[PDB]
Design a protein around this ligand. Structure first.
Ligand SMILES: O=c1ccn([C@@H]2O[C@H](COP(=O)(O)OP(=O)(O)O[C@H]3O[C@H](CO)[C@@H](O)[C@H](O)[C@H]3F)[C@@H](O)[C@H]2O)c(=O)[nH]1
Ligand SMILES: COc1cc2ccc(=O)oc2cc1O
Length: 455
């Protein structure tokens, strides 16, 4: 079989598509080709294309150029809509690239943002699926959002009662996805539109697994009110993640090698994440006062060398206790290391999966997208994370609170209890993605669905 997987422009959307491609190719002998939509501008992932042009197995990458869209955006236009327009205007280029395909794919594939390709899948009459690369809960939200639109008048964020998704958990108004923060903003309309677009596909892949969200998945499958909207299968195929590159002369890993087991706290706010000047200074102090060992991936604050935004003397005072790394670090290789025993994270789903597959517990610190609905899940339901009393996005987290949180996770028995839960999650994830595992079984049902359309 041939499948073509379509990726959106940023690295954060490319890598998950690659991991899916690699998984299918290796474990299911299905020839794959990734149509990666590029920015045709920044292109800080186009060099990764060069790096990947070298070891292709299947694993055939086709770059697709975008246009310059500065004419359709404005300082105030938000990222969600940005992505939406980029693809929207890339549509013709996709149409052309699939035409002039050497062997036709037999099956199309869309990332959350590349849903507007459905048109060109129906033309040429090819099997079409979407990849929702985070929680089942957020999927349920997206789909049922079209109903909420009509049921609620006024702004979601001001409600005194939680939002009740048929079958799934109750969503507290504060923990809503970014699109639902303001209904007057175009991203909201795009969001509800996305929710509707999902249902039009022949099936929806989700990088979770049954044991993680049993009720929510069962709701998607069987809840009457929801099934009035959905009407097609769901495929929990996760948790999928990057492979480890057992690394040699990386000084972070060499530092970590000199530390004790589960004694280091990794701090990272994902690709793109940045704090305020005040928040960053309070964080810095928190880590110092904790007297705990850490690796801190730092970028400039939002509201240069990484010492002007840091407390004077910090680096010399924290020498031998912490390790401050600029912009990027090898997260997967860190998290897999024996000496890492905690993760202060923004709760991006890839970060979370990388942490849970490793049995590392977390300090949830949600910033954007659905990170608030993931933080909620991790802390409340799953019990593998702790969080500040008030959301960080609403109020400044001061040094005392931080230093406690870090203390509570890397010293106290409560911390160890949380860790033990994360290990259980790890094991359950392993059992799936294993032969006989529900997630593995989910692809086998996917491949069955694909072959059925071909005959
Ligand atoms: O210093 C670094 C920083 C990142 N990475 C890697 O980049 C990826 C980041 O994805 P992740 O889900 O963790 O966060 P991010 O893309 O920043 O945030 C959104 O990710 C998605 C995009 O909106 C969204 O689904 C999610 O809700 C958001 F959180 C992930 O594979 C990390 O391992 C790294 O190796 N080192
Ligand atoms: C780029 O910012 C994003 C925001 C959202 C919001 C809701 C959601 O389900 O997915 C997202 C994925 C993103 O990549």
């Amino acid at each position: 079989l041939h499948v073509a997987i379509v990726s959106s422009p940023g690295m954060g959307h490319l890598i998950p598509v690659l991991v899916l491609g690699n998984r299918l190719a290796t474990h299911h002998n299905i020839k794959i080709t990734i149509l990666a939509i590029t920015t045709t501008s920044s292109s800080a992932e186009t060099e990764f294309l060069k790096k990947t042009t070298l070891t292709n197995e299947t694993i055939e990458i086709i770059p697709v150029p975008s246009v310059d869209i500065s004419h359709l955006i404005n300082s105030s236009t938000k990222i969600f809509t940005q992505l939406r327009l980029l693809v929207r205007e890339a549509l013709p280029k996709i149409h052309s690239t699939i035409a002039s395909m050497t062997h036709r794919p037999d099956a199309l594939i869309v990332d959350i943002f590349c849903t507007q390709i459905l048109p060109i899948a129906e033309e040429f009459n090819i099997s079409k699926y979407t990849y929702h690369p985070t929680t089942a809960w957020t999927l349920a939200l997206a789909i049922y959002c079209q109903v909420f639109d009509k049921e609620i008048e006024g702004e979601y964020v001001e409600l005194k009662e939680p939002l009740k998704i048929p079958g799934c958990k109750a969503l507290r108004p504060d923990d809503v996805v970014d699109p639902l923060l303001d209904r007057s903003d175009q991203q909201y309309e795009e969001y509800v539109k996305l929710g509707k677009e999902y249902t039009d596909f022949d099936g929806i892949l989700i990088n979770t697994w049954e044991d993680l969200e049993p009720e929510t998945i069962n709701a998607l499958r069987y809840n009457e009110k929801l099934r009035l909207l959905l009407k097609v299968p769901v495929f929990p195929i996760g948790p999928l993640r990057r492979k480890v590159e057992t690394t040699l002369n990386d000084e972070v890993i060499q530092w970590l090698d000199k530390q004790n087991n589960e004694s280091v706290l990794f701090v990272s706010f994902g690709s793109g994440g940045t704090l305020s000047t005040k928040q960053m200074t309070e964080l810095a102090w928190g880590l110092e006062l904790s007297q705990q060992k850490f690796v801190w991936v730092v970028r400039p604050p939002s509201d240069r060398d990484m010492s002007e935004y840091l407390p004077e003397g910090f680096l010399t005072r924290t020498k031998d206790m912490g390790l401050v790394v600029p912009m990027w670090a090898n997260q997967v290789e860190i998290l897999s290391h024996s000496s890492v025993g905690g993760f202060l994270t923004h709760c991006g789903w890839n970060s979370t999966v990388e942490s849970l597959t490793n049995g590392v517990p977390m300090i949830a610190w949600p910033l954007h997208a659905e990170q608030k609905m993931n933080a909620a899940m991790l802390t409340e339901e799953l019990g593998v994370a702790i969080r500040p009393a008030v959301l960080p996005t609403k109020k400044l987290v001061k040094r005392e609170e931080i230093q406690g949180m870090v203390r509570i996770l890397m010293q106290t028995k409560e911390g160890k209890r949380i860790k033990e839960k994360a290990k259980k999650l790890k094991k359950s994830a392993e059992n799936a993605l294993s032969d006989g595992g529900s997630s593995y079984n989910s692809i086998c049902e996917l491949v069955k669905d694909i072959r059925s359309r071909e005959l």
